[PDB]
Amino acid sequence: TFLSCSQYHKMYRTVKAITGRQIFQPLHALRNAEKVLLPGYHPFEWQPPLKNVSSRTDVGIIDGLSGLASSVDEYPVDTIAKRFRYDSALVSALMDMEEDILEGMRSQDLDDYLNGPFTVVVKESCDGMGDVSEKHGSGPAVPEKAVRFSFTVMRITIEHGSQNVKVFEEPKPNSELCCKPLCLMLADESDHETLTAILSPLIAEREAMKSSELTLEMGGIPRTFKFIFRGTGYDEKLVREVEGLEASGSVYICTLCDTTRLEASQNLVFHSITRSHAENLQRYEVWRSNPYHESVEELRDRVKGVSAKPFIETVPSIDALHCDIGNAAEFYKIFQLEIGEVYKHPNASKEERKRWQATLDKHLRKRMNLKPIMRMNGNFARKLMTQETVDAVCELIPSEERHEALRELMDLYLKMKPVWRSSCPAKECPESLCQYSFNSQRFAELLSTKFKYRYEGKITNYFHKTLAHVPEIIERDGSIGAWASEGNQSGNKLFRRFRKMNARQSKCYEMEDVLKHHWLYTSKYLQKFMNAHNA
Amino acid sequence: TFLSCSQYHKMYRTVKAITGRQIFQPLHALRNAEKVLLPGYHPFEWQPPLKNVSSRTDVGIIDGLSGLASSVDEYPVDTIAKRFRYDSALVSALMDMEEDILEGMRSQDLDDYLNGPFTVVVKESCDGMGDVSEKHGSGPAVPEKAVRFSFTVMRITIEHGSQNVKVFEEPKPNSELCCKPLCLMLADESDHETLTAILSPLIAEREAMKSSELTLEMGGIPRTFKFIFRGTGYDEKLVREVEGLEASGSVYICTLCDTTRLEASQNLVFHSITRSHAENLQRYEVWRSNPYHESVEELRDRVKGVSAKPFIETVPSIDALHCDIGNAAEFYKIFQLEIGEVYKHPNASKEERKRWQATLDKHLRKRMNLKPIMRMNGNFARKLMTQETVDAVCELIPSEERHEALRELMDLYLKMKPVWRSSCPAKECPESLCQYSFNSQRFAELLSTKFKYRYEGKITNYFHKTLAHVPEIIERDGSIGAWASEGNQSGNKLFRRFRKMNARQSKCYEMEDVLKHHWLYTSKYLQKFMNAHNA
DNA sequence: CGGGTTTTTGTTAAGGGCTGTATCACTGTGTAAGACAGGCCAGATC
DNA sequence: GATCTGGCCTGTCTTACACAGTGATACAGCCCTTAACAAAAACCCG
DNA sequence: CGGGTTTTTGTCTGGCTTCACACTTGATTTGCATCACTGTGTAAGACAGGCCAGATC
DNA sequence: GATCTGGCCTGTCTTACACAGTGATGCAAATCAAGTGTGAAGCCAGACAAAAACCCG
Ligand SMILES: [Ca+2]
Ligand SMILES: [Ca+2]
Ligand SMILES: [Ca+2]
Ligand SMILES: [Ca+2]
Ligand SMILES: [Zn+2]
Ligand SMILES: [Zn+2]
């Protein structure tokens, strides 16, 4: 309930004074009871020991700069960052769901006196949250950004007998309160130097603890764990910045295959995900050495766009949220243009377009109760992509050809959305799952012909993604929308709320408190209570 | 505790689910007990019936605009305003403190079943609190102001037998929890037209209920109330504007007497109070009519600087908060002046001055660690009026005579301050009061002799108020601290809080809700619970 | 009113774990009108 | 054209406009053992 | 391993309490669901035409 | 002088960067208002007699 400290004291003391009894507990008896949910309280043993990692088990908050020498003689740094160690945070994530994993193995008809080598499957995400300042006193504010690195326990399993049996899955994967924060900093997502400085220790630990066994007593017997990390919450901009690729508006578009933007337009859907991470490392090495002595052009053509040392590891996937939003904006543009009726007469001035936009806005508002926006909301997208909107727009297009065109377009888009939309299309919507190939293919066919006036050259990349990489990702990784960033993006409001109402205003502790509160919020043994009214 | 209407529901359902038996009441049963405290719930009748005031007893939150016709053909008015009536607010303010007045009646050895002609003393106040907006869209350069008109009950007195008795007195008058709001609006405090248009009905009701009696049952049997209204919580700018004088830069300074600065600076302290409200009004009349057929330059002098129609009967008296802050900044500037020792070499330019300021601020931050601030706050003002800091600056400054000429002046100021800083100095410091004559005339003589290089012409206003009036205003009214605006001012913060934790986002309920919550907060039948742990 | 019951009352003392307020370090900014006073001056008038 | 101004331009000086709220830390009471000596309003038959 | 020796059991009839279980039909609290409303144009970066200033022939 | 070209300059298009939370109204479903006559249950009153952890063998 985002209460402060003094407020809680007021409520407690007055309840006690009135009703005689003592329902709520005092403060010190609350600190001494939260010290059991932050990291670095439990005992744990790595084996074999972790290279380059300390062995102590008393590591709570630690400084994000990781001991970066900051004097007037070196590269100036002026950021703030706080973080948990990876291993301690991970063991706390485990000891905050001991009860759930026990209930799981019980329901699955197993023995609780079992300490088989469970395998965890984690999801990692990192999205900037710029413009989180506010005016202090009475005046303006300064545009300072921020970045938060966080993960999510997603699927715990165990190989009993001969096959693996699933013991725990997340109910709502990309929810607002099951992405647990791990590090946060007041930096920018493009200040590559500072970003790498802060995220180098975390990636070092994440690589180190990938060939070991963690041991800790899990309610009685001691139990062992392996790990499998799958970084997916990265949006297109990040995944295109860190992993090594060039900027966003390149000629090489898809971060999974390697085809020129033009070449995507000729052949739409027959490609194959062909971009690992070690491949990016060796390609950057080729770019650096240049063993064949080619000019910059032929070189960049050979290495397929990569021109920087891949700094992090990231699996190739589709950020469902931004993908849907981009498709929606794409359809908005095609509606504007179709009001333009430019397929007959092209290349108008940059006033007819403004007129088309304004009349489209007024019309759709007065017919569907939709106020005009530019920064498109996901809600705005869901409200726009409705067959009713197509029917309301079709009056402003003269001919039946455009009628049937827009009709078929929206119909196929809504027959393809559920596949990459649901959280497990393997069972929840298998019909579109088995139709998706033919569906997307005919969609592409009528997109090339009926609209060649627009998609004859440049085709925006998200279309290529939605068209030629969704079936393979499905077959590879089960769900799609499960591994999305929306599980994190919603945390921005929590960040701002905490920073406003729970902090100490020192720019140094001022992140310890925010991170601690976020961790506490996102626990599970602490929500099993707030969900009590479900008897 | 500034909870919401849904967070409270969270707390309620979780407590009820955990401990079985409910400990917090539901929401509907909270609102049904909310109604019994908002104004407009009880019967009450006037004797004689108030002319121009309705007779109903079920008026809640009335639109402040007072049915102001706002059609494009008329004056464009766009502010928002909400209010109570005045009687329906006084009634509730009395009937919540029913128990606290009956207890006083008991303690003062009086037959409980008494229904004498009670008399209430009500202090009225008003002060603009601009810069309330927020750049929710992250776009700066958009200000907005607000105004709150509020009152306070301060003494309830009955005339038993031969004399009167203090059935009730206020513990801490100028605090933020015993000043009740009455109306509020979104308009610049100097937008004279809108201000009058909104505040006229209140003065109508106030002048109506000044020659009547309110009959109302008070704990069983009925009792009769009559009122007295003293308007005192007005800063300098308001009392200068609404009472109809020339602005603060005038040659005429004192809102209580009629003397020009170039005359009070010579006749130091022998004045009185001779500027009432009816005198002010008839003087505006003789201005407007101009019966003597005399030019403007001497007419202005004849009417002692009145040039507008005053529309609020307000009693004149020195404020406390702003007076102390003014004196503080005043002798801070005299410190900065004494750095340059300009008495020896005069007429320096405006760069030596900035250097003097920088030196003073740095020396003070090194010695007494007084932070640097542009807009002085009462905390700073108290921090700077110390013998320690004047001794530090005295050790910075070169010469010696300045040591006497500043330290003795400062200790005179400190010997003077409490008789007005206090809250009931009629008996708390009944010695400094009787010495105030000497204690102030010595200040006067020394400012006239060892500092006449500044105070030969222009003397600031507050240094005239403190000098000439307070030893008479004490005998006139009583306290000088209790009749101050510290209370309402402190309330300002609360506004913003409620505004973005309790509001329905309609710009027409965003003031209903704020007013209602502020009312509930500032009750007394509620704080009687939050003070349980004490008793 | 009172000596001795009638059921109690400090109290005051030797040290120790639990509670409940009082601090502690630490941050938010240079304005916006209005009145009066000289100084400069650029056309007014003899 | 000299000598005047009132018109304008600066050019200061006055009053307003935020420091109170956050988590952590630090002390002061405040119950807990016996224990005896004194102390104590309340009241009966004296 | 065992018999006999403890902390603690099955039931003996019976007399004095609380508690519920019915079925009675409306007068109420309590729990969710829903309602109207209220935030602004990018900001870096890749690529392509087209002038045109200035090199060449 | 004629002609190609590299550099500058716009101009276009790609990914990005904020809307859930506020009080209130309104149905809809459990809950109680006093009703009464019966279980029915329990409290065990020491006593008499057997069930499972422990000294003497
Ligand atoms: Ca992003
Ligand atoms: Ca984002
Ligand atoms: Ca003011
Ligand atoms: Ca104020
Ligand atoms: Zn691709
Ligand atoms: Zn005066």
CA of B253 to C1' of D9 (A): 27
**Could you tell me which residues come within 8 angstroms of residue A32 by beta carbon, excluding any fewer than 6 positions away?**
none
Q: Quote the CA–CA distance of A130 and A186 in Å, as a whole number.
A: 9
Q: Do B532 and A17 touch (CB under 8 A)?
A: yes
Asked whether A157 and A121 are in contact (CB, 8 A), the reply is yes
Is B365 within 7 A of strand C by CB distance? no
- For residue A507 the two structure tokens come to 């720019």
Separation of CA B257 and ligand 6 centre (Å): 5
Q: Quote the CA–CA distance of A492 and B153 in Å, as a whole number.
A: 46
Question: What is the separation of C-alpha A165 from the centre of its chain, rounded to a whole number of angstroms?
Answer: 27
**Could you tell me which residues come within 8 angstroms of residue B461 by beta carbon, excluding any fewer than 6 positions away?**
B236, B248, B253, B254, B326
| Chain D, protein-covered positions (CB within 7 A) | 12-24
- For residue A163 the two structure tokens come to 């096959």
Separation of CA B346 and ligand 2 centre (Å): 62
Q: Do A2 and B1 touch (CB under 8 A)?
A: no
Rg, C-alpha atoms of chain B: 26
Question: What is the separation of C-alpha B16 from the centre of its chain, rounded to a whole number of angstroms?
Answer: 44
Q: Quote the CA–CA distance of A532 and A529 in Å, as a whole number.
A: 5
Q: Is the dihedral of CA B168, B174, B178, B183 positive or negative?
A: positive
Strand boundaries in A162-263, DSSP class E: 163-169, 180-185, 213-217, 222-231
**Strand-strand pairing, A180-185 and B147-160:** unpaired
In single-letter form, the type of residue at position B375 comes to R
Collect residues with CB below 5 Å from ion ligand 2: A 127, 489
**Could you tell me which residues come within 8 angstroms of residue A307 by beta carbon, excluding any fewer than 6 positions away?**
A244, A246, A284, A287, A300
- The CB density around residue A275, as the number of other CB atoms within 10 Å, is 19
Strand, coil or helix: B10: helix
Rg, C-alpha atoms of chain A: 26
Q: Quote the CA–CA distance of B240 and B303 in Å, as a whole number.
A: 15
State the smallest CA–CA distance between residue B7 and chain A in angstroms. Answer: 6
Residues of A in contact with B377 (CB under 8 A): none
- For residue A278 the two structure tokens come to 């070690």
In A22-70, where does DSSP find H-type helix?
28-34
What is the number of residues in chain B?
535
Intra-chain end-to-end CA distance of chain B, in Å: 20
**Strand-strand pairing, B81-83 and A213-217:** unpaired
Q: By what technique were these coordinates determined? A: cryo-EM
Residues of B in contact with A532 (CB under 8 A): 14, 17-18
Q: Quote the CA–CA distance of A336 and A325 in Å, as a whole number.
A: 17
Q: Quote the CA–CA distance of B197 and B83 in Å, as a whole number.
A: 13
Q: Do B14 and A533 touch (CB under 8 A)?
A: yes
Residues belonging to chain A with any Cβ–Cβ distance to chain B shorter than 8 Å: 1-3, 7, 10-11, 13-19, 23, 131, 135, 138, 140-141, 529-530, 532-533, 535
Residue to substitute from B14, B22, B136, B501, interface A, most A β-carbons within 10 A = B14
From the CA of A261, the nearest ligand is 5
Kindly provide the b/e burial profile for residues A132-157, where b requires at least 16 CB atoms within 10 angstroms of the residue's own CB: ebeeeeeeeeeeebbbbbbbbbbbbb
DSSP state of B502: S
Strand, coil or helix: A63: strand
DSSP state of B251: S
> Of A374, A280, A392, nearest to A332 (Cα)?
A374
Resolution expressed in Å: 3.7
Q: Quote the CA–CA distance of B236 and B318 in Å, as a whole number.
A: 9
Q: What share of chain A is helix, strand, coil (3-state, %, to 5)?
A: 45, 10, 45
Kindly compute the dihedral angle of the four CA atoms of residues B493, B499, B502, B504, in this order, to the nearest 10 degrees: 170
CA of B96 to C1' of D36 (A): 54
Phi and psi, residue B219, nearest 5°: 65, 65
What is the number of residues in chain A?
535
Q: Quote the CA–CA distance of B154 and B172 in Å, as a whole number.
A: 9
- For residue B381 the two structure tokens come to 């003002």
Q: Quote the CA–CA distance of B190 and A523 in Å, as a whole number.
A: 53
Asked whether B151 and B121 are in contact (CB, 8 A), the reply is no
Footprint of strand F on the protein (CB under 7 A): A 127-131, 235-237, 248-249, 319, 322, 325-326, 329, 350, 373, 375, 377-379, 458-462, 489-490, 492-493; B 4-7, 28, 31, 136-137, 501-505, 513, 516
- For residue A409 the two structure tokens come to 């377009």
Kindly compute the dihedral angle of the four CA atoms of residues B173, B179, B185, B190, in this order, to the nearest 10 degrees: -10
Distances in Å between the alpha carbon of B517 and those of A47, A529, B128, B503, B510? 60, 31, 20, 10, 11
The helix/strand count (H/E) of chain B reads as: 21, 9
Burial class (CB in 10 A: 0-12, 13-18, 19+), A481: buried
Question: What is the separation of C-alpha A528 from the centre of its chain, rounded to a whole number of angstroms?
Answer: 25
- The CB density around residue A304, as the number of other CB atoms within 10 Å, is 17
Q: Quote the CA–CA distance of B448 and B268 in Å, as a whole number.
A: 9
Q: Quote the CA–CA distance of A451 and A334 in Å, as a whole number.
A: 10
Q: Quote the CA–CA distance of B270 and B444 in Å, as a whole number.
A: 12
In single-letter form, the type of residue at position B197 comes to A
Q: Which run of H or E residues covers position B103?
A: helix B98-107
Residues of B in contact with A11 (CB under 8 A): 1
State the smallest CA–CA distance between residue A370 and chain B in angstroms. Answer: 18
What contacts 24+ positions apart, CB below 8 Å, involve A380-387? A380/A328, A381/A324, A381/A325, A381/A327, A381/A328, A381/A329, A384/A328, A384/A331, A384/A332, A385/A328, A385/A331, A385/A410, A385/A413, A385/A414, A385/A417, A387/A411, A387/A414
> Of A340, A344, A357, nearest to A453 (Cα)?
A344
**Residue B67 Rama label (left phi>0; alpha psi -120 to 50; beta):** left
Asked whether A120 and A213 are in contact (CB, 8 A), the reply is no
Asked whether B269 and B441 are in contact (CB, 8 A), the reply is yes
Q: Largest alpha-carbon pair distance within chain B?
A: 86
> Of A524, A415, A529, A424, nearest to A474 (Cα)?
A424
DSSP state of B221: S
> Of B206, B190, B194, B157, nearest to B51 (Cα)?
B206
Burial class (CB in 10 A: 0-12, 13-18, 19+), B427: exposed
In single-letter form, the type of residue at position B27 comes to L
State the smallest CA–CA distance between residue A124 and chain B in angstroms. Answer: 30
Residues of B in contact with A23 (CB under 8 A): 15, 19, 23
Asked whether B44 and B57 are in contact (CB, 8 A), the reply is yes
- For residue B333 the two structure tokens come to 């500037």
Separation of CA A147 and ligand 2 centre (Å): 10
DSSP state of B50: P
**Could you tell me which residues come within 8 angstroms of residue A408 by beta carbon, excluding any fewer than 6 positions away?**
A446
Q: Quote the CA–CA distance of A378 and A421 in Å, as a whole number.
A: 12
In single-letter form, the type of residue at position A223 comes to R
Intra-chain end-to-end CA distance of chain A, in Å: 22
Separation of CA A483 and ligand 1 centre (Å): 15
Residue entry with tokens 């209790």:
B482
Asked whether A420 and A486 are in contact (CB, 8 A), the reply is no
